[PDB]
Write a protein that binds this ligand. Structure first.
Ligand SMILES: C[C@H](N)CC(=O)OP(=O)(O)OC[C@H]1O[C@@H](n2cnc3c(N)ncnc32)[C@H](O)[C@@H]1O
Ligand SMILES: [Cl-]
Length: 488
């Protein structure tokens, strides 16, 4: 209590000093359900730290963490955080190719996966280990670090999330976001927060901070369940979840095929949170009706600050509302609307480019200062301070009451399975296939690319599909290729 909380693990474990016996994270012990309590979570966390802290690792050395969200994964990140080892979450569904690209660029001292983890193939240069309820065990010792660093500063890295582009987030950035979000009273200490995102998104951490920072319980939702809407609803039933967080699309199956079962949870679920994509209004209304007690909140923003705004979906949604609002920044934040020349937009209803100023901003992109300098630009409203501000690439306009409406992107960034895809990079790659002169990508959800053959060339459908995968991930592969004579 005498100790001020300026680091990630010190924040998420406050419940271990105030409410030690409260259940912190739901956890399956074989087939017998249990709960890890704030105190127990803290013990696993330090049990892990002891195993880690004797390995010669310096503060700043990176560690890869391969797991679905679970109490042991939280323990691992807590431990990493306790040692100033920034951590890189990765989800077990991750393609070999993609993982070793992350390992390669971030050059971590150590890789760790779940007890059950069936991963192999890591460089001998990289330490290897495992974790679960029974403890943390190292297999291949990591090379020791410099033995030079001595204290963890709020500006130091806490974690990095990878799109390969890593967003590097300090201890402060993540605590300002946590402090912004909790100011909204989305949840209480009796809440059971069902977390759906993959551990490799940002969103998982948002879920964990929401629950733990509110004294609540994290309910890890096994992702398997998303393609079995009934099994997914029974899971929410039996876990007795009261808050459910996820991309809008987690609800699609249940609203479409299982609305009766879902509405059987209507008395227990008091909140639902979404970010990433807009929620289509038909479905939002459906969900409001199936869950009549639920406060539905639209979380808008970006990994580069986790997020920015939390905005209540009105109940019911007025009939001629085509878009939900994204509100205004949480306390201590501001999304400024600027024009093309960075001049402020003061007129309501005029679209502008959101520039975010907060205590939450990413430190930079890993090993990519040029991108970092394009994203965190000097503050156009007051550039002489030295202060930097985040050029989001998102457009919006404000109404006369001061609320924001998302107008889409200024570039061609798109979302596919929640992963940021720049459509111009699909186009460029397709265009470097021989016999293609130009391409145009577009989303309809499905990704199509339209292509204009160079003069003379014959064109092989599948040869392109495969050629794209050579350097584009699976979510960036076209599902539909259409040849044309020319391009409008
Ligand atoms: C918690 C998580 N980090 C949120 C997120 O989506 O992270 P990120 O992968 O970094 O997505 C960035 C973009 O998604 C879009 N977005 C984001 N939330 C919304 C929204 N609620 N409505 C509409 N568009 C949105 C905006 O384009 C954002 O610029
Ligand atoms: Cl704002």
């Amino acid at each position: 209590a005498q100790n001020p909380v300026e680091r990630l693990h010190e924040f998420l474990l406050t419940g271990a000093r105030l409410t030690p016996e409260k259940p912190a994270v739901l956890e399956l012990s074989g087939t017998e359900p249990g709960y890890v309590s704030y105190r127990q979570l803290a013990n696993r966390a330090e049990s892990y730290a002891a195993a880690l802290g004797g390995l010669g690792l310096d503060i700043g050395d990176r560690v890869v963490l391969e797991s679905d969200t679970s109490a042991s994964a939280i323990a691992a990140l807590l431990a990493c955080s306790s040692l100033g080892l920034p951590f890189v979450p990765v989800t077990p569904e991750t393609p070999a190719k993609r993982l070793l690209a992350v390992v390669d660029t971030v050059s971590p001292a150590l890789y760790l996966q779940a007890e059950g983890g069936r991963r192999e193939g890591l460089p001998e240069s990289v330490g290897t280990g495992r974790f679960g309820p029974g403890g943390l065990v190292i297999e291949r010792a990591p090379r020791p670090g410099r033995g030079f660093r001595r204290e963890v500063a709020p500006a130091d890295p806490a974690y990095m999330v990878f799109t390969p582009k890593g967003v590097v987030m300090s201890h402060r950035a993540i605590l300002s976001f946590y402090r912004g979000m909790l100011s909204q009273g989305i949840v209480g200490p009796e809440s059971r927060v069902a977390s759906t995102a993959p551990f490799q998104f940002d969103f998982s951490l948002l879920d964990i901070g929401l629950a733990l920072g509110s004294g609540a319980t994290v309910v890890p939702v096994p992702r398997a369940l998303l393609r079995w809407p009934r099994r997914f609803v029974r899971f929410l039933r039996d876990s007795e979840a009261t808050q459910v967080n996820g991309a809008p699309s987690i609800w699609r199956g249940a609203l479409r095929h299982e609305a009766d079962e879902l509405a059987a949870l209507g008395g227990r679920i008091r909140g639902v949170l979404f970010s990433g994509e807009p929620f289509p209004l038909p479905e939002v209304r459906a969900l409001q009706q199936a869950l009549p007690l639920a406060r539905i909140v639209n979380c808008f923003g970006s990994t580069e600050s986790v997020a920015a705004s939390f905005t209540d979906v009105p109940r019911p949604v007025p009939d001629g509302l085509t878009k939900l609002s994204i509100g205004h920044a949480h306390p201590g934040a501001e999304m400024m609307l600027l024009d093309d020349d960075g001049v402020p937009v003061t007129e309501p209803g005029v679209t502008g480019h959101i520039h975010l100023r907060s205590g939450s901003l990413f430190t930079g992109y890993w090993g990519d200062p040029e991108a970092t300098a394009r994203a965190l630009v000097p503050d156009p409203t007051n550039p002489m301070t030295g202060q930097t501000v985040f050029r989001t690439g998102d457009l919006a306009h404000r109404d006369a009451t001061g609320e924001l409406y998302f107008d889409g992107r200024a570039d061609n960034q798109v979302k596919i399975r929640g992963n940021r895809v720049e459509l111009t990079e699909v186009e460029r790659r397709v265009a470097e296939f021989t016999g293609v002169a130009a391409a145009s990508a577009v989303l309809l959800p499905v990704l199509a690319v339209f292509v204009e053959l160079s003069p003379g060339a014959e064109f092989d459908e599948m040869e392109l599909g495969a050629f794209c995968l050579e350097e584009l991930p699976d979510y960036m592969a076209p599902q539909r290729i259409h040849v044309l004579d020319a391009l409008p």
